[PDB]
Amino acid sequence: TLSILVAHDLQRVIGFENQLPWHLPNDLKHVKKLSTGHTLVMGRKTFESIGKPLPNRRNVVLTSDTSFNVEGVDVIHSIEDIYQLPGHVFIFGGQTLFEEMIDKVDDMYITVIEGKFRGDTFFPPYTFEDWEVASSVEGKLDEKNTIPHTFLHLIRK
């Protein structure tokens, strides 16, 4: 299975100045639950933003930099390499990876952040004409999670 994993706001903002624009611990728990024991593929900027691989999954970084050889990370240099990765592979960002992969993936796990943030990077437009809502789950709000959000699993029709 090849899936997208993304959090985007009401206007599809995903990032600002190489960080996520919001603080939402519940989304990180969601990412942990979905991708633990599987594979994340991410662009170089996304990797540099987190600074080290996420524990307990295969971390794969797509970059043209042939000097990239980082402990605990596998490197790939072509989109085509993604198709050779075994098991459940999640396309993890950022904007450039999402744009390159949205027409190729089987499904998408989207956290819709129900607010409008300042962004400099975006998820590409998509239409529910093309995507079946396999599930839609409102996230719970509390002291540590104060922005409304919804977890959508979309499957290509």
Annotated binding site for NADP(+), which residues? 6-7, 14-19, 43-46, 62-65, 92-97, 100, 121
Write down the least CB distance from residue 81 to ligand Q19, Å. Answer: 19
113 binds, among ligand Q19, ligand NAP, none (CB under 5 to 8 A by kind): none
Cis preceding linkage at 94, omega within 30: yes
Q: Which does 15 bind (CB under 5 to 8 A by kind): ligand NAP, ligand Q19, none?
A: ligand NAP
φ and ψ at 68, to 5 degrees?
A: -70, 115
Measured from each CB, the residue nearest to ligand Q19 is 7
Could you tell me the CA-to-CA distances from 87 to 1, 37, 57 in Å, in that order? Answer: 7, 10, 11
Residues within the interface to ligand Q19 (CB under 6 A): 5-7, 20, 27-28, 30-31, 46, 50, 54, 92-93, 111
Half-sphere exposure (Cβ direction) of 156: Cα atoms closer than 13 Å: 11
Cα(62)–Cα(74) distance, rounded to whole angstroms? 9
3-state DSSP assignment of residue 77: coil
One of 2, 28, 38, 44 touching ligand NAP (CB under 6 A): 44
- Give, as ranges, the residues between 127 and 156 that touch ligand NAP (CB under 6 A): none
Q: Are 42 and 100 in contact (CB under 8 A)?
A: no
**Sites of contact with ligand NAP (CB under 6 A):** 6-7, 14-15, 18-20, 42-46, 49, 62-65, 77-79, 92-97, 100, 121
